[PDB]
Amino acid sequence: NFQKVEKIGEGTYGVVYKARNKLTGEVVALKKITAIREISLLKELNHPNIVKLLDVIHTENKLYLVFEFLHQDLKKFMDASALTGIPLPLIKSYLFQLLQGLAFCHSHRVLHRDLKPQNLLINTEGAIKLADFGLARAFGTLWYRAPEILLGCKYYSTAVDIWSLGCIFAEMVTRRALFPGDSEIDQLFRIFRTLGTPDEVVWPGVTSMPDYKPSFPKWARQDFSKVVPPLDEDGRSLLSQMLHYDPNKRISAKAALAHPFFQDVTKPVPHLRL
């Protein structure tokens, strides 16, 4: 019933295929993986910045998700733009849209928990969409992981997606990953080395988190101007609020949309080689 066109890739739950409905002619993305009920609820989520979950297929005791198809992800686009960099107006537009998507999902009590360039999809009209929202909770790369997760907190908040987005924001600007850790501790220490080793002053409760060790080295925080040059102060300001250690102090998606950084936001058209 579905015609395997090509392997889009390998996800976190299963393998992804570009597929054609051998009846409707529809071109879709197919992912082969209490969960049934939960992901079925996700079908109701509709937002221009969220990849549409078309249908949930539970058959032969196996689970397929049918998604709206988009041709390119942010990862491939960043690689293709690595020489020149993505223009600031397009970076700003993408960030603005992504925050809209987060704000919508967060208002409906849906988290992503696993944001990364590979699940951010773009099209020819200058739109960008979040894929895999709510899949983490339903079904039960460390670079974009929030520090509270790395410190073994069992209870996640919307703030984890904001951290991830912040990391992706910085990566778009510098054309290099912000915290490319190769293990949980390397990831953690890369964060510490840049933002300063967290303490009770900046993050009340941190020394009581399950995987926190008093034996953590004490790195001083470095100037933000060194981290995302040559982003202007509006952008650096927004980023620092997205990268607060304390998830309670970390800026929400709705508040982020009101940041002065987005005062001159537009919607440019990217040139894609599809």
Ligand SMILES: O=C(O)[C@H]1CSC(c2nc3ccc(O)cc3s2)=N1
């Ligand atoms: O599944 C993942 O972990 C990451 C890597 S593969 C992937 C993709 N998801 C979609 C969803 C819809 C679509 O048209 C393309 C992709 S690629 N997201």
